[PDB]
């Protein structure tokens, strides 16, 4: 379909908290180590002030922290989720389908992927490369998208609603049952793919 509606918000949500983009790809690195992430370890690795760190992640109010107030999650978390993200053994966990697409690249690591149809339960997954995904396991695996909603925490308005689909049709049935998310849309997991690839692309653009 036409993607670029979906781009352009996910780009600009980003994009409404200076440096999100610069301090995104610093803390993926060092959550998919496995282990909880110090905000003063992040600021030396941003060569930022703590202020600086801190605006950016308050923004991202679902931000994860554990009891040493450590950051064990943005995006990619330590925390359980029904999205499976292994990188080596690690056993780790992404918010959304979409950003198990992604991340890969952004870290520059194969992951493999795995979860449940949000519509029948069955399990999926995948081999997700920084340039291909590979061993799509059913083949037809879909995944739903709506509109990235402006002034809103990413998670709670976009991709809370992004999730992985046995099938096209069985994704199609789903979504005709919900009709109050505006630009609800189902998608393959390859067109999926390939929308994570365009977001990044300008997400890159866009660091300094
Ligand atoms: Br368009």
Same mark, same amino acid.
């Given at each position: 379909?036409?993607?670029?509606?979906?781009?352009?918000?996910?780009?600009?949500?980003?994009?409404?908290?200076?440096?999100?983009?610069?301090?995104?790809?610093?803390?993926?690195?060092?959550? @998919?180590? +496995?282990? $909880? %992430? *110090?905000? /003063?370890?992040?600021?030396?690795?941003?060569?930022?002030?703590?202020?600086?760190?801190? &605006?950016?992640?308050?923004?991202?109010?679902?931000?994860?922290?554990?009891?040493?107030?450590?950051?064990?999650?943005?995006?990619?978390?330590?925390?359980?989720?029904?999205?499976?993200?292994?990188?080596?053994?690690?056993?780790?966990?992404?918010?959304?389908?979409?950003?198990?697409?992604?991340?890969?690249?952004?870290?520059?690591?194969?992951?493999?992927?795995?979860?449940?149809?949000? @519509?029948? +339960?069955? $399990? %999926? *997954?995948? /081999?997700?490369?920084?340039?291909?995904?590979?061993?799509?396991?059913?083949?037809?695996? &879909?995944?739903?998208?709506?509109?990235?909603?402006?002034?809103?925490?990413?998670?709670?308005?976009?991709?809370?609603?992004?999730?992985?689909?046995?099938?096209?049709?069985?994704?199609?049935?789903?979504?005709?049952?919900?009709?109050?998310?505006?630009?609800?849309?189902?998608?393959?997991?390859?067109?999926?793919?390939?929308?994570?690839?365009?977001?990044?692309?300008?997400?890159?653009?866009?660091?300094?």
């Amino acid at each position: 379909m036409k993607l670029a509606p979906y781009i352009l918000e996910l780009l600009t949500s980003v994009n409404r908290t200076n440096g999100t983009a610069d301090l995104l790809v610093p803390l993926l690195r060092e959550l @998919a180590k +496995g282990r $909880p %992430v *110090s905000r /003063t370890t992040l600021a030396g690795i941003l060569d930022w002030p703590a202020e600086r760190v801190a &605006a950016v992640l308050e923004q991202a109010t679902s931000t994860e922290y554990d009891k040493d107030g450590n950051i064990i999650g943005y995006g990619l978390t330590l925390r359980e989720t029904s999205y499976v993200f292994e990188i080596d053994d690690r056993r780790l966990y992404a918010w959304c389908a979409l950003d198990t697409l992604i991340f890969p690249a952004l870290i520059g690591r194969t992951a493999r992927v795995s979860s449940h149809c949000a @519509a029948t +339960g069955a $399990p %999926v *997954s995948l /081999t997700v490369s920084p340039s291909e995904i590979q061993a799509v396991e059913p083949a037809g695996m &879909a995944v739903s998208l709506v509109l990235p909603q402006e002034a809103a925490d990413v998670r709670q308005s976009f991709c809370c609603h992004v999730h992985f689909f046995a099938s096209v049709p069985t994704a199609e049935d789903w979504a005709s049952k919900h009709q109050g998310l505006e630009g609800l849309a189902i998608v393959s997991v390859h067109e999926a793919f390939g929308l994570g690839q365009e977001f990044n692309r300008h997400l890159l653009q866009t660091m300094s």
